[PDB]
């Protein structure tokens, strides 16, 4: 029962998923500080914001 530390999953080229070729594949946050650069998660049942924890279902 040793306390193992979390290791962050090194996703290879995580930058290269929000666009094709032009436009944005993912959603953008409608908040003031978050948005125009802040992408949203696209989960199988929800949308999640990595900055202000905004949740849309």
């Amino acid at each position: 029962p040793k306390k193992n530390k979390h290791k962050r999953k090194k996703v290879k080229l995580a930058v290269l998923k929000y666009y094709k070729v032009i436009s944005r594949l993912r959603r953008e946050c409608p908040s003031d500080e978050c948005g125009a650069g802040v992408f949203m998660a696209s989960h199988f049942d929800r949308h999640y914001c990595g900055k202000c924890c905004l949740t849309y279902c």
């Binding site: 930058v15 290269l16 666009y19 070729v21 032009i22 125009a36 650069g37 802040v38």
Partner: protein, 108 residues
């Protein structure tokens, strides 16, 4: 023209404005606060090197082309005194602090 660019990047590190890295260049450019963009010409993958000029023209941002990235990295402050020499393929200056007038008249 590179001599007139070394002064405006140096005062950006003094005022801590510029954003190094591809994603920091991407995040700052579409926030309508970016002022100029620097692109390294030695990019192996062509899918991301052609995105940056599409993004800046959409947000009406001018573009500066530089041949080297490791030389770009050591100029923008990615080296310590240099033992480790690393570079970035893109960097965007957020805000400024003589030749900055020379740089802005070059586009016109």
């Amino acid at each position: 023209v590179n001599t007139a660019l070394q002064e405006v990047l140096k005062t950006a590190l003094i005022h801590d404005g510029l954003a190094r890295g591809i994603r920091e260049a991407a995040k700052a450019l579409d926030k309508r606060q970016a002022h100029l963009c620097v692109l390294a010409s030695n990019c192996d993958e062509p899918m991301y090197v052609k995105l940056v000029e599409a993004l800046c023209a959409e947000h009406q941002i001018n573009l500066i082309k530089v041949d080297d990235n490791k030389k770009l990295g050591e100029w923008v402050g990615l080296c310590k005194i240099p033992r480790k020499v690393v570079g970035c393929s893109c960097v965007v200056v957020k805000d400024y602090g003589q030749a900055k007038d020379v740089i802005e008249e070059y586009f016109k």
